[PDB]
Curated annotation (Swiss-Prot):
Disulfide bonds: none annotated. This is Proto-oncogene tyrosine-protein kinase Src. Part of a complex comprised of PTPRA, BCAR1, BCAR3 (via SH2 domain) and SRC; the formation of the complex is dependent on integrin mediated-tyrosine phosphorylation of PTPRA. Interacts with DDEF1/ASAP1; via the SH3 domain. Interacts with CCPG1. Identified in a complex containing FGFR4, NCAM1, CDH2, PLCG1, FRS2, SRC, SHC1, GAP43 and CTTN. Interacts with ERBB2, STAT1 and PNN. Interacts with DDR1, DDR2 and DAB2. Interacts with CDCP1, TGFB1I1 and TOM1L2. Interacts with the cytoplasmic domain of MUC1, phosphorylates it and increases binding of MUC1 with beta-catenin. (Microbial infection) Interacts with HEV ORF3 protein; via the SH3 domain. The chain holds residues 144 to 251 of 536 of the full protein. The phosphorylated form is termed pp60c-src. S-nitrosylation is important for activation of its kinase activity.
Amino acid sequence: DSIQAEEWYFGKITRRESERLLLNAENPRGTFLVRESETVKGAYALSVSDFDNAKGLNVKHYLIRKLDSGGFYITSRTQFNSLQQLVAYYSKHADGLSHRLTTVSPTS
C-alpha cells in the first residue's frame, strides 16, 4: 500500500490549507491528515484538530522525520516502518501528542 492510496495522505498541501480543512467546528477533536513538510525536505507533517484550554480550536502540527536507513518517527524512541503504522499507533493512544487521531480529514 503506497501512501498516495491512503485517505489521510494529502501530499503537497500548505500548512495554511491543512488548517482551513481541520479548523472546521464540525470535526471531532483529533481530525487529521499527513502532508509533506514545508520546513524539512523529505519529512512529513501530521496535522491534527485540537481544542486547547486557553486557545480553543487550533491545529497541532507534528514533524514526522524519515530515517535514510528506513523508518519514521515523531519521537526518536518510537520508530515505525511506515506512515501507515505511525497513523495506526497514534490512532490508539496520544502517547505524546495533545490527543489521539480519531477522524480522517474531510476533503473540503
